[PDB]
């Protein structure tokens, strides 16, 4: 686990996604249970909010284990394969 990376891989993934995509996201996103700190997700924020930005979001709220397997499931919800599975190998490393 890092610390720069790990908001990297969240950017990364998010700016390869982002054009038309975020928007999709970020609906994605409110469609799931928010779970109590999600529950108040600074929507004026993702809003305006393109990938980097958008990343910066979830850090904000949750922590990394949550984000980690979070980030994922929208891509999966996406259909995103290829660079869901790069956040796989990278945002989720399953350690410890």
Same mark, same amino acid.
């Given at each position: 686990?890092?610390?720069?990376?790990?908001?990297?891989?969240?950017?990364?993934?998010?700016?390869?996604?982002? *054009?038309?995509e975020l928007?999709?996201?970020?609906?994605?996103?409110?469609?799931?249970?928010?779970?109590?700190?999600?529950?108040?997700?600074?929507?004026?924020?993702? *809003? +305006?909010?393109?990938?980097?930005?958008l990343?910066?979001i979830?850090?904000?709220?949750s922590?990394?284990?949550?984000?980690?397997?979070?980030?994922?499931?929208?891509? +999966?919800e996406?259909?995103?394969?290829?660079?869901?599975?790069?956040?796989?190998? *990278?945002?989720? *490393?399953?350690?410890?």
């Open positions: 686990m890092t610390s720069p990376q790990l908001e990297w891989t969240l950017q990364t993934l998010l700016e390869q996604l982002n *054009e038309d928007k999709s996201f970020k609906s994605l996103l409110w469609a799931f249970p928010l779970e109590d700190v999600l529950q108040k997700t600074p929507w004026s924020e993702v *809003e +305006e909010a393109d990938g980097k930005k990343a910066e979830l850090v904000n709220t922590s990394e284990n949550w984000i980690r397997n979070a980030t994922v499931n929208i891509l +999966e996406m259909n995103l394969t290829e660079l869901c599975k790069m956040a796989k190998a *990278e945002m989720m *490393e399953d350690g410890q």
